[model samples]
Target: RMKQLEDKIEELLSKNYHLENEIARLKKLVG
Candidate 1:
């Protein structure tokens, strides 16, 4: 159970990181 939660957290963090990078790229393109 704990391992499953940890994995889920990691996945979310990775997804968040990806989204942040994408947003940064778009902002640079627009600016």
Candidate 2:
């Protein structure tokens, strides 16, 4: 159970990282 929770957390962080990168890219285009 603990391992499963850790895996989910890692997945969320990975998605968050990519989301931040995408936001930066859009900001550059809009600015």
Candidate 3:
């Protein structure tokens, strides 16, 4: 159960990174 929770966290973190990265990249292109 503990391992499953950790994996979920890792997955969420990865997704968050992708989102933030995309946002920042677009902002730079726009400016």
Candidate 4:
């Protein structure tokens, strides 16, 4: 339980940060 919870939350935060940046770049690139 502890192992799973720790890894999951860490990656999720990083993934969201990465995805948000990509989205902005893609939109900017769209124009």
Model 4 TM-score relative to the real fold: 0.68
Using TM-score as the measure, the top candidate is 2
Record all residue pairs in model 4 with backbone atoms less than 3 Å apart, i.e. clashing. Answer: none
Angstrom error at residue 20, model 1: 0.4
Superposition-based RMSD of candidate 3 using all C-alpha atoms, in angstroms:
0.9
Question: Which ten residues in a row are the worst by lDDT in model 3?
Answer: 22-31
Global fold similarity of model 1 (TM-score):
0.87
**Model 2 agreement with the true structure over 1-31: per-residue lDDT tens digits:** 9999999999999999999999999999995
Q: Assess candidate 1 and give its lDDT.
A: 0.98
Question: Cα lDDT of all candidates, in order?
Answer: 0.98, 0.98, 0.99, 0.97
- All candidates: TM-score: 0.87, 0.88, 0.76, 0.68
**Relative to the unseen true structure, what is the C-alpha lDDT of residue 15 in candidate 1, on a scale of 0 to 100?**
100
- Please tell me which model should have the higher lDDT, number 2 or number 4: 2
What's the CA error at residue 4 for candidate 3, in Å? 0.5
Clashes of 2: 0
Local accuracy of candidate 3 as per-residue lDDT tens digits, 1-31 = 9999999999999999999999999999996
* Candidate 4 lDDT over residue span 1-31, tens digit each: 9999999999999999999999999999996
